[PDB]
Write a protein that binds this ligand. Structure first.
Ligand SMILES: [Mn+2]
Length: 259
DNA sequence: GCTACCATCG
DNA sequence: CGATGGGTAGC
């Protein structure tokens, strides 16, 4: 049984403060994809690099206390790719790939364009140059999980107030259209949507108002899976027993064996 | 201090 | 629909 976790820690140090470290072991997971480390290698402790003896790898940004993704794994990954290859986005560190034989897990931090229009443009280009990547990986022949903060809502079911957010970044017709071109066109499987067609599955609630309390959140964290592995998925859930961050850890469980 | 990241109301 | 607001992490 292969348990994979995706979690935007929104600063890994705070998460470890709020008992995320302990949680990693408690969940008895085999792979953990974290987004937004908000730090650098020199900034992280040994436990934030190799939690509980679990191997680990990371991509950090040039900016201190900014962005950064990582992947922990009980098994020693055969190959590792830091950064997409596009320096423009690699200077922010949002892509980390780890091959574990037949399997390849990817931690992705899709840029959020809700801070400025220019950031929205950078996000758009990210999508444009990343689509071909999703396609190539779709045509490798290996089972590839993509855990990440896509920061894009697909349908009206993926967010509580889908009605008053069409003029807001994250639910813009363009972005949603891209996602569609990924699931149906590219042939990826929205693991959660495929396991639970009627469950909202919110994974993020804004600090504004009392949203988190009223379960007024979005679903911006995805695990896009290849058909072969997609079918092998047995369950999934959004862990909320403890709040480590404004995001909630997506825990998917597959009946897979990379060996 | 500066940077980055929409729910409730008028 | 449009006008009108917010608290986080980390340097
Ligand atoms: Mn964040």
């Amino acid at each position: 049984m292969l348990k994979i976790i995706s979690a935007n820690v929104n600063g890994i140090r705070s998460a470890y403060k709020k008992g995320f470290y302990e949680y990693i072991a408690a969940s008895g997971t085999d792979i953990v994809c974290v987004q937004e480390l908000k730090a650098q290698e020199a900034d992280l402790s040994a436990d934030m690099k190799n939690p509980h003896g679990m191997h680990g790898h990371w991509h950090c940004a040039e900016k201190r206390g900014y962005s950064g993704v990582a992947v922990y794994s009980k098994r020693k990954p055969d190959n590792v790719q830091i950064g997409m290859g596009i320096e423009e986005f690699d200077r922010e560190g949002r892509f980390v790939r780890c091959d574990f034989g037949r399997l390849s897990v990817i931690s992705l931090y899709l840029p959020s364009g809700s801070s400025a229009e220019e950031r929205q443009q950078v996000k758009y280009r990210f999508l444009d140059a990343f689509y071909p990547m999703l396609e190539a990986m779709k045509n490798e022949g290996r089972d590839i999980v993509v855990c990440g903060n896509w920061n894009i809502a697909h349908q009206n079911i993926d967010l509580k107030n889908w009605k008053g957010n069409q003029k807001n970044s994250g639910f813009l017709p363009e972005e949603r259209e891209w996602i569609g071109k990924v699931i149906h066109k590219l042939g990826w499987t929205d693991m959660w949507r495929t396991l639970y067609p009627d469950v909202p599955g919110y994974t993020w609630w804004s600090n504004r108002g009392q949203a988190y309390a009223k379960d007024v959140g979005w679903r911006i964290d995805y695990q896009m899976v290849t058909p072969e592995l997609a079918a092998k998925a047995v369950s999934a859930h959004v862990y909320k027993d403890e709040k480590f961050s404004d995001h909630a850890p997506l825990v998917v469980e597959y009946d897979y064996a990379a060996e």
